[PDB]
Each structure stands twice: as structure tokens, then as C-alpha cells.
Amino acid sequence: WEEESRRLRGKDISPCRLLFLDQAARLDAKSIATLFELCERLQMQLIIA
């Protein structure tokens, strides 16, 4: 979606990135760590509960 749209947007505009998860306890410590790794690498926000 971003690859498509950034062409059709102001060249200095970077849309926000935010995701969700319910019952986040299905994650464990390593799960959390790696997800945060990749999330930061992609400059994205989490709402994981």
C-alpha cells in the first residue's frame, strides 16, 4: 500500500504504520523481542494486548 501511495502523495509525507493483536499472551519473551525488532526496523506501531 505504501509503495503504491507514496508516489501519489507529498514526497515528504510518510504515512503512519500501526497494527493490533488481541490475546497478546500467545506471545512469549522471544516472540515479543523479535516482533519489536522487526517493528522498529519497519518504523511501525503496535497495539498488542
Next chain:
Amino acid sequence: VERDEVAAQKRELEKQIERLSQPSGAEDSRMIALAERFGGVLLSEIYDDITIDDAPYFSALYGPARHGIVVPDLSLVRPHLETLEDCPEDLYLIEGDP
């Protein structure tokens, strides 16, 4: 002979009706394809709801580019331009916010 003449007429009519059919403008082909090859929205679609009274002026102004495609960047179409051998022999591209 008369029947064959009428058949030719009907064939022309059907082909042209198709030419006016979908989805906006003439057809879904290379021109609509550029809407995803790049952000090439069709000019005619960009004025889809043109009033019938301005539509003649719009058409005359846009000239053959009437069927042109608006693309905020046409330096950006450059990398893919070499791909377009299967394209209408002569293809319009425009710069601006569709």
C-alpha cells in the same frame, strides 16, 4: 449481397459499442494498465462526471491526449518505457496530482 452488407454494418456497430463499453473511457487495456504500472489514472476517468456541455470543450482541449493518463511523474515512467512495445502506437502521459 444486401445481407452481407448489413452484417458488416452490424459488426462495425458491435465493435464500436465494445469500444465505448468499459470501464471508463474506451477500454481496459494498456491505458488502464498504466494506472498500476504507475499511478497513471486515466484523464477521461479523471473527468468522468464532466457535464455534457463541457465535455465537448474538454475533448477539444485535451485533443488526442483526451485519452491521456495523468502521472505526477513521467521521469518515473522512464524505467518501464522500454517495456511498452505492446501499447497504442502513440501514448500520452501527463504530470500532476490525479
Next chain:
Amino acid sequence: RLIEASLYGGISSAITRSLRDYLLPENSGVRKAFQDMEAALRENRITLE
């Protein structure tokens, strides 16, 4: 769909099948072609009856 799939993500969910929905565009060309076939068949049926 992005929203709900993230909310209920993971492999063991409808997400893994509705991928073909969420990832892919709906093609009007095939829709139109099928309608044209339908018209042809209708005319054939009328003639045959």
C-alpha cells in the same frame, strides 16, 4: 480486513485462506467477459427454443 486480520492474526485463522481476498484485486475484466458469455448463451438458448 487488514485490521481484523491483525486483531486475530496468526496462521491458524481465516486469514490464511482469505489471503486471496486481502492481497488481491477484484478484476472487472473477467466479470465483464463472463457477462458477455452469458449474453451469448442466452441468445443461443433463445434460438434453440
